[PDB]
Design a protein around this ligand. Structure first.
Ligand SMILES: Nc1ncnc2c1ncn2[C@@H]1O[C@H](COP(=O)(O)CP(=O)(O)OP(=O)(O)O)[C@@H](O)[C@H]1O
Ligand SMILES: [Mg+2]
Ligand SMILES: [Zn+2]
Ligand SMILES: [Zn+2]
Ligand SMILES: [Zn+2]
Lengths: 46, 65, 33, 84, 134, 56, 56, 263
RNA sequence: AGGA
């Protein structure tokens, strides 16, 4: 449960806080994505 | 980019008819005009759906994440 | 020997990485073939 | 200078611009809760009331028609023909 | 369909005729001001500045960024940022008033320097309507 | 443009659905309007006086 | 010519135009959203008091 | 046997050719319209997304899910949520479907109309089952996944009509024709040299007599005899797109009578 | 850089 950030290439879960270095815990590439809400999204199918 | 379910113009389900249309072309060595017709697509509205589709999904699938 | 500034490279040119890359490589590279 | 009633040489007819300005002025007045000089026969739009006042010729206004020299003829909305 | 206009099959439009995806990337970065004076990517509250946007800050998480699932609408704050002075001034990036949609992709990176760099892609689906050009 | 006395005319409001201004087809010529994506301007008078000017 | 001869103005709206055979020569189709923005300042008078109290 | 007659030319699982006789055009057409527009069906109308790692957008997929034809055989014993007394939905007024798919394989993993599973109670009534007319029994291809590409959705199918959205369209195209020999002059053929040569002859010409040139114009002649073909999508069987059309139109008229009664 |  809970995965704060996702690496843009290797797709490994990161889960970091403010002042914890914007970089992957394996490869380099400082990209990092946000990982969608637990607050679930609903669409009228039209 | 991914086969449309239902013909825009008349609403005939076309979502199932893709995998087969591709087989009738490769496996059965058929021409488009026959393949389409064997799948029941008689009205030109239905024909253009399958005939003029560009299954872009297949390219997008080629990217890692 | 000595560093005299940086030159912007045109994509797909000799000096660019993609010039030598194959379809399969470009896809890995997150670039449209 | 102000031209006398005998000696007035402008149209005996009201101008498209005069009529419009009168209807506007009276509508604006009626709307600002001014007294109405006509029976509103169930009337509620100040412009529609203004048309009724002009029709019954019960509008207490005067047109001051200025001339290029600066002189003028004063005309009552009562006396002005409405062929418009 | 007179004078260069046309009649479209509402039924067809429902079936997916002419629908489009629309994306837009709002971007921002934490700025450093000589004397190690940095900006913060955070969700702000009242706190002496009171200089904040008229729309909801509630869609923001503790990093001052909306999660990549959330439906955004008015001038909803998409990026939360503050600049204090000699305290939380607001530097929060709201969704273009005229627009709306769903947060698509949020990207948290590093500046050429070493500052916190952020890019937010928002996505909407545009359905053929009456004034639309073809 | 607005090269005409008739390139600005007063109309009766008709509140309607959908996002476009709708005009009668015969009124198309004085404006030089067509529906290949033309846009038009609407001006609301704020006085009882200005309204009259427009209607009259 | 920029700020005196011409001016930007309030009580103004602009959208795409489309033709309607069901509109009268003198009317204009005004999108609801536009009507809900453009306002006319009506004075509280005995003739309208009740009507206005309802729109408020 | 009675008033307007019917003569089925060809029947099948999903197509009915028939000749409607002893009717007014205004009635054949009113029936035509109803079959397209006003017969109720069941269709996915709410998609709640839990996960999507796909190349397609949440709403793009959502749109597709609505268009997937569902069993609407017993649609009459289901309520419109509007009419139903619950907060949102329930078993009285909806069918709840589930879709979970993940790319376990190295090869492209497909997502089908079959992969949908009913999680609600169907009160023992023929409804909600995705229509599979497919040869290999798969139905509509919703999506495609690669590896860690996951999909998680909960779908609420509801009773509705085509007038609200075409996804509740019980029928595909409806063939309709009258007077294959233009004896009524309801058309004036555009030609170059000869209208009779340049314009193809209808298959229905065989079921009516040719005009015979040496005859005066029959002005008295009225339009009856309608060559029609109703095609089903799957939700409701062909016969029922015809029957339920007739019943829908009938109720629509009866409402007017009842409206006059309350008056 | 685009729109009538
Ligand atoms: N630069 C410009 N400045 C002012 N008005 C312009 C303009 N360009 C176009 N217009 C206006 O737009 C009108 C339409 O021009 P176009 O969009 O090119 C179609 P058209 O030339 O009228 O031929 P068509 O009606 O047979 O299609 C003009 O008649 C003119 O009033
Ligand atoms: Mg034009
Ligand atoms: Zn990594
Ligand atoms: Zn079709
Ligand atoms: Zn219910």
């Amino acid at each position: 449960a809970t995965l704060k950030y996702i690496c843009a290439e290797c797709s490994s879960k990161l889960s970091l806080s403010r002042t914890d270095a914007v970089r992957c815990k394996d490869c380099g590439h400082r990209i990092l994505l946000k990982a969608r809400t637990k607050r679930l999204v609903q669409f009228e199918a039209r | 980019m991914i086969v449309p379910v239902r013909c825009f113009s008349c609403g005939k389900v076309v979502g199932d008819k893709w995998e087969s249309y591709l087989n009738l072309l490769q496996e059965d060595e058929l021409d488009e005009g026959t393949a389409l017709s064997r799948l029941g697509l008689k009205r030109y509205c239905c024909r253009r759906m399958i005939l003029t589709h560009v299954d872009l999904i297949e390219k997008f699938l080629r990217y890692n994440p | 020997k000595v560093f005299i500034g940086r030159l912007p490279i045109m994509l797909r040119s000799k000096n660019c990485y993609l010039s030598e890359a194959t379809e399969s490589d470009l896809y890995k590279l997150k670039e449209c073939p | 200078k102000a031209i006398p009633k005998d000696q007035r040489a402008t149209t005996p007819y009201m101008t498209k611009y005069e009529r419009a300005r009168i209807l506007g002025t009276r509508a604006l007045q009626i709307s600002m809760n001014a007294p109405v000089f006509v029976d509103l026969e169930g009337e509620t739009d100040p412009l529609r009331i203004a048309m009724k006042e002009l029709a019954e010729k019960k509008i207490p206004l005067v047109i001051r028609r200025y001339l290029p020299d600066g002189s003028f003829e004063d005309w009552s909305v009562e006396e002005l023909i409405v062929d418009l | 369909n007179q004078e260069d206009s046309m009649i479209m099959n509402q039924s067809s439009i429902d079936r997916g005729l002419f629908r489009s995806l629309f994306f837009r990337s709002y971007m921002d970065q934490e700025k450093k001001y000589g004397m190690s004076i940095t900006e913060t990517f955070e969700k702000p509250q009242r706190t002496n500045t009171l200089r904040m946007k008229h729309g909801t800050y509630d869609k923001l998480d503790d990093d001052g960024l909306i999660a990549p699932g959330v439906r955004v609408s008015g001038e909803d704050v998409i990026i939360g940022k503050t600049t204090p002075i000699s305290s939380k001034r607001d530097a929060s990036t709201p969704l273009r008033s005229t627009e709306n949609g769903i947060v698509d992709q949020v990207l948290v990176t590093t500046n050429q320097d070493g500052l916190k760099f952020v890019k937010v892609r928002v996505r909407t689906t545009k359905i053929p309507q009456i004034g639309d050009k073809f | 443009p607005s090269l005409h006395k008739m390139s600005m005319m007063a109309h009766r409001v008709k509140v309607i659905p959908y996002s476009t201004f709708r005009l009668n087809l015969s009124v198309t010529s004085p404006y030089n309007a067509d529906f290949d994506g033309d846009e038009m301007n609407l001006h609301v008078p704020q006085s009882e006086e200005t309204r009259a000017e427009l209607s009259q | 010519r920029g700020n005196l001869m011409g001016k930007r103005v309030d009580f103004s709206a602009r959208t795409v135009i489309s033709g309607d055979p069901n509109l009268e020569l003198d009317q204009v189709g005004v999108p609801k959203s536009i009507a809900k923005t453009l306002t006319y300042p009506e004075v509280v008078t005995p003739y309208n008091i009740d009507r206005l109290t309802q729109l408020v | 046997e009675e008033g307007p007659q019917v003569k089925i030319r060809e029947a099948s699982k999903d197509n009915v050719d028939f000749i409607l006789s002893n009717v007014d055009l205004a009635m054949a057409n009113s029936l035509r319209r109803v079959m397209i527009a006003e017969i109720p069906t069941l269709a996915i109308d709410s998609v709640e997304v839990e996960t999507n790692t796909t190349v397609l957008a949440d709403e793009f997929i959502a749109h597709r899910l609505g268009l997937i034809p569902l069993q609407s055989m017993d649609i009459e014993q289901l309520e419109y949520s509007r009419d139903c007394f619950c907060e949102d939905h329930c078993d009285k007024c909806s069918v709840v479907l589930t879709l979970q798919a993940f790319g376990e394989s190295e090869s492209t993993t497909n997502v089908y109309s079959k992969d949908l599973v009913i999680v609600s109670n169907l009160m023992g009534r023929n409804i909600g089952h995705p229509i599979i007319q497919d040869k290999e029994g798969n139905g509509v291809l919703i999506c495609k996944l690669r590896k860690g590409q996951e999909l998680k959705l909960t779908c609420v199918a509801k009773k509705g009509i085509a007038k609200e959205h075409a996804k509740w369209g019980p029928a595909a195209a409806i063939e309709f024709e009258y007077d294959p020999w233009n004896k009524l002059k309801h058309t004036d053929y555009w030609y170059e040299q000869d209208s009779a040569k340049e314009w193809p002859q209808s298959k229905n010409c065989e079921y009516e007599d040719p005009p015979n040139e040496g005859d005066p114009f029959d002005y008295k002649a009225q339009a009856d005899t309608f060559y029609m073909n109703v095609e089903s999508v799957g939700s409701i069987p062909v016969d029922q797109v015809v029957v339920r059309g007739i019943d829908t139109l009938q109720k629509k008229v009866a409402s007017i009578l009842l409206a006059l009664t309350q008056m």
